[PDB]
Write a protein that binds this ligand. Structure first.
Ligand SMILES: NC(=O)c1ccc[n+]([C@@H]2O[C@H](COP(=O)([O-])OP(=O)(O)OC[C@H]3O[C@@H](n4cnc5c(N)ncnc54)[C@H](O)[C@@H]3O)[C@@H](O)[C@H]2O)c1
Ligand SMILES: NC(=O)c1ccc[n+]([C@@H]2O[C@H](COP(=O)([O-])OP(=O)(O)OC[C@H]3O[C@@H](n4cnc5c(N)ncnc54)[C@H](O)[C@@H]3O)[C@@H](O)[C@H]2O)c1
Ligand SMILES: NC(=O)c1ccc[n+]([C@@H]2O[C@H](COP(=O)([O-])OP(=O)(O)OC[C@H]3O[C@@H](n4cnc5c(N)ncnc54)[C@H](O)[C@@H]3O)[C@@H](O)[C@H]2O)c1
Ligand SMILES: NC(=O)c1ccc[n+]([C@@H]2O[C@H](COP(=O)([O-])OP(=O)(O)OC[C@H]3O[C@@H](n4cnc5c(N)ncnc54)[C@H](O)[C@@H]3O)[C@@H](O)[C@H]2O)c1
Ligand SMILES: Cc1ccc(Cn2cnc(-c3cccs3)c2)cc1
Ligand SMILES: Cc1ccc(Cn2cnc(-c3cccs3)c2)cc1
Ligand SMILES: Cc1ccc(Cn2cnc(-c3cccs3)c2)cc1
Ligand SMILES: Cc1ccc(Cn2cnc(-c3cccs3)c2)cc1
Lengths: 257, 257, 257, 257
């Protein structure tokens, strides 16, 4: 496929509903060789199962909150992939209290710190740690949400973390471009995944979106997966520092009441 | 390839340097069945030659300035493609006097009229005329330039025509989405094509861009072609109403002096 | 006031509800010397009355559809105001048929032509015609709508006209800046004026906005009037080429129910 | 003046060059009653002097890094100003090592942490702490930089901090709007202040901008001061959640040589 010969690292797989799952499948469909990472013991065997379904057996632990974890992960990957062609960063976090209700009243200094560190810093942290191992022609992908551009009720500090993330896409795209590395983001529409629970009135949101979205349907991880496969293939060599909205046109329309 | 089974109409092929040429090749590479249109007698045989190189023999005349031309073209296409899956609109025009020097002093009411009619209206005009012939899952693609978003010296009224074009992408994406049609645009970086002559200090521009562009190189029609192939394939079903910048990151950086 | 000693030309006063009326009141309050134009005889006397109230007896006719009309109006204005400090462009138009329903089915070549000529070009037409009469430190102002940036139902081709006008603002600003002229636009929230009748379900829209606008209320021509007076005074010297949104925050929020 | 009867809290006055100084002068001129804070003792006396000149003797200490510091400062302020009308957040910070060179190599976890806490969170921290002391019709203001939207060399992690801060503005605005509070930011062009020394080749940058900025000159703290005074007065009632660029048009133009 259009990814044949590419060795890509996919983070964030937690379940079959995971966006990183849809991406991994698609990337695997187009012929990329995948490696995976899991956050903790809770997820290890699951990811190991999915990795094996995708012909991969490179499943390493990684908690983006620990510089040492990252470093150690990239050290284990090297042993088998001395050089690779990028990675998908499908990670994100904010303490529970954070995404519920009035942003000003919900936000706290420590939640703000955690939301940013895990959701925005982690991206560069990982690039930082594997810079040397990247082959020219490499692509780094990340996922964001409209909440970075607009104020979405309950999204709260995550909006700020995403804004921070998108800017991180630009600065990393500018600094790494000279050595063959592109860096982009997909601003996906809401999808029903593990992240759904945490957010207030989700199932209600997904119904409103479907009715007001140009394509009249919410996007699927399949959809996202295909756009991610493309963004990590040479087919997109002219795109770098870009936040591609894969939301069925939701963001460009207004008052589709 | 990822376009196999798609019947796409490609407008704008004038020469091997043409952006629509790079797109046609790529689309042909991924297995789409192409049909072409030519503006006048001057271009007919050329396009006919390229069409034949791409296994196509559907070469129809079309001058987007004539509603009747458009209608007649779509009538001839129907005879062979009763239903198709979209079209690439690689057309654009502005009288010579228009793109030279001080915008305020250069712009005139008639140049403004022509620049918009050909560069922005034509897009919807064509969708208008083939709406019925479009298969659900159809994608319409158009090409724009950064001049729509920023003020570029000498680009002058074309900036306004492009702004108009991009907005046209949104409104058409919103109205057609409900019936299976997506509409997008590629905001490409400057490429040396027939359009180069018309613009002041081009070769100088292309050198400045290469030095300040994240990927440190200007994009190629190959680059654009691949992004267009993707935007017209089901791989991008989640993207609609989007202006994807295929400019190597030029637009997201600043003062890369 | 902050406009003391400024002679500003106010276009578009049609009624006491008109955005041009609110802006005139405001600049008048702030100490600017005003001059007004009217489209035709049907509005001659009225505008003459309003001008009177605002202490002005410079009420010149002007139909922006005629370069000749513009040229002659600036001729008459010169007789009294050899040099002035800017003008407010509060004109917009699109044939009735264009504004209701499916954009793709409503939009027609002439409609698109008329929409962009009156709503977008006229702004520069006027700049062209008085460029030499403008004092250093002048400011030109125009009114846009979020329809330029997003796809709003029924706004149809007017969305493209405004997108084109907003880009007109950036080109004009970059062109005239070096000679002491700033050009800006105000993207106003929906207001109840003569534009009310001609747009499908306005009342429903003005109730939705209020509900969802951060300031929980639609803006008033007073509100816009004050941002307008500020954008044409030296208080906004550092601002040019900008589209300041005066919509109570409407556009920055998303899914506020 | 247009700020008569407003009690505004001005943060960040470090020197006569400080953007906070220009803004204070401006609001003072317009008739607002001011209160000031200083980061530490090194700046106690100075700020006390400036405040004096501006007819104010409310000079409270505040280190935005301590929720405790903020809480106590609003305690003291309450004693005299039980209810006030807004505050100017003119604070920014990132450890020296973060700002020079390749962003990817310069950025470090703590740097990123410190950058976002001081430059982005503090804005909301302060809102949180005085939310109940704010009068209806209040306005909060912050200063951003184009670095949030584009990738500027050496701005590095500060680009992400500002991106995060700009999104803070939209969330805060959507949250506090319903209670009579507007929140806006000013994206100012480069100015010569205490931020000058710490950024690589500032002088070269301030000469480039002047050359390429539509108004052909860098903005002054006076310029910003006036946009600031306007954004915190009732003249901007219809404006909230907005990032008004006060950069002489710099960001709207492209390739102006
Ligand atoms: N699904 C949606 O509706 C949606 C929409 C738009 C954007 N997003 C974004 O897509 C990404 C993936 O979300 P999803 O819906 O697939 O979520 P998911 O809940 O399935 O997985 C999130 C991943 O985050 C990982 N993670 C959290 N902390 C980590 C850390 N400390 N170290 C390593 N891994 C860590 C988890 O292991 C998890 O697998 C996020 O950036 C999210 O914001 C999701
Ligand atoms: N090449 C560049 O540097 C560049 C960069 C960005 C955007 N663009 C855009 O890409 C498109 C294609 O440009 P290109 O560089 O490949 O140009 P090109 O000069 O090779 O071809 C332009 C096409 O416009 C067509 N055209 C003009 N008037 C027409 C009409 N009346 N009816 C039918 N066809 C008509 C011509 O036949 C021509 O083939 C345009 O929209 C252009 O703005 C070009
Ligand atoms: N009403 C709103 O909520 C809204 C929202 C955002 C922006 N605006 C814009 O502000 C502007 C002011 O419109 P308005 O709502 O004040 O309504 P209005 O009916 O008062 O003003 C529109 C003006 O354009 C004038 N005009 C039209 N064609 C003319 C021509 N050929 N030459 C000269 N004058 C002509 C009309 O006489 C009229 O005075 C419009 O451009 C509108 O798009 C309106
Ligand atoms: N100088 C420019 O051209 C530029 C451009 C755009 C925006 N801005 C922004 O405007 C703001 C004002 O900066 P400035 O240029 O006026 O320089 P400055 O040196 O006058 O002000 C920065 C202020 O932040 C204060 N500060 C930092 N950490 C503190 C903390 N822990 N708690 C409380 N106060 C602390 C500093 O004392 C100082 O007064 C900054 O946020 C800056 O990013 C500056
Ligand atoms: C608690 C938590 C778990 C997982 C996430 C990931 N996430 C980020 N954004 C989102 C959402 C986008 C749309 C609706 S929820 C989810 C965020 C918070
Ligand atoms: C005269 C003319 C011929 C062809 C075009 C097409 N065109 C549109 N934009 C461009 C350019 C983008 C970058 C540099 S020139 C070319 C425009 C004008
Ligand atoms: C048919 C027509 C005539 C005049 C206008 C002027 N106009 C521009 N924008 C608007 C409106 C925006 C929001 C509500 S009305 C009105 C628009 C359409
Ligand atoms: C190290 C550091 C300390 C303080 C700042 C404050 N700051 C923010 N933005 C700026 C500047 C933008 C343009 C020129 S200086 C300075 C930035 C970096």
């Amino acid at each position: 496929g259009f990814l044949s010969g590419k060795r890509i690292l996919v983070t964030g797989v937690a379940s079959k509903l995971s966006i990183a799952y849809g991406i991994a499948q698609a990337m695997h469909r187009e012929g990329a060789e995948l490696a995976f990472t899991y956050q903790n013991d809770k997820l290890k065997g699951r990811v190991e199962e999915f990795a094996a379904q995708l012909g991969s057996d490179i499943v390493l632990q990684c908690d983006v909150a620990e510089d040492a974890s990252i470093d150690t992960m990239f050290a284990e990957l090297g042993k088998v992939w001395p050089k690779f062609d990028g990675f998908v960063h499908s990670i994100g976090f904010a303490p529970g209290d954070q995404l519920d209700g009035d942003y000003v009243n919900a936000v706290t200094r420590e939640g703000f710190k955690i939301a940013h560190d895990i959701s925005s810093y982690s991206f560069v942290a990982m690039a930082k740690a594997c810079r040397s191992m990247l082959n020219p022609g490499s692509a780094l992908l990340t996922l964001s949400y409209l909440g970075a551009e607009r104020a979405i009720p309950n999204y709260n500090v995550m909006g700020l973390a995403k804004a921070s993330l998108e800017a991180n896409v630009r600065y990393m795209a500018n600094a790494m471009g000279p050595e063959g590395v592109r860096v982009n983001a997909i601003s996906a529409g809401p999808i029903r995944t593990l992240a759904a629970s945490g957010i207030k009135d989700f199932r209600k949101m997904l119904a409103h979106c479907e009715a007001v979205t140009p394509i009249r349907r919410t996007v699927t991880i399949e959809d996202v997966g295909n756009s991610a496969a493309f963004l990590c293939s040479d087919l997109s060599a002219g795109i770098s520092g870009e936040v591609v909205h894969v939301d069925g046109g939701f963001s460009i329309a207004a008052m589709n009441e």
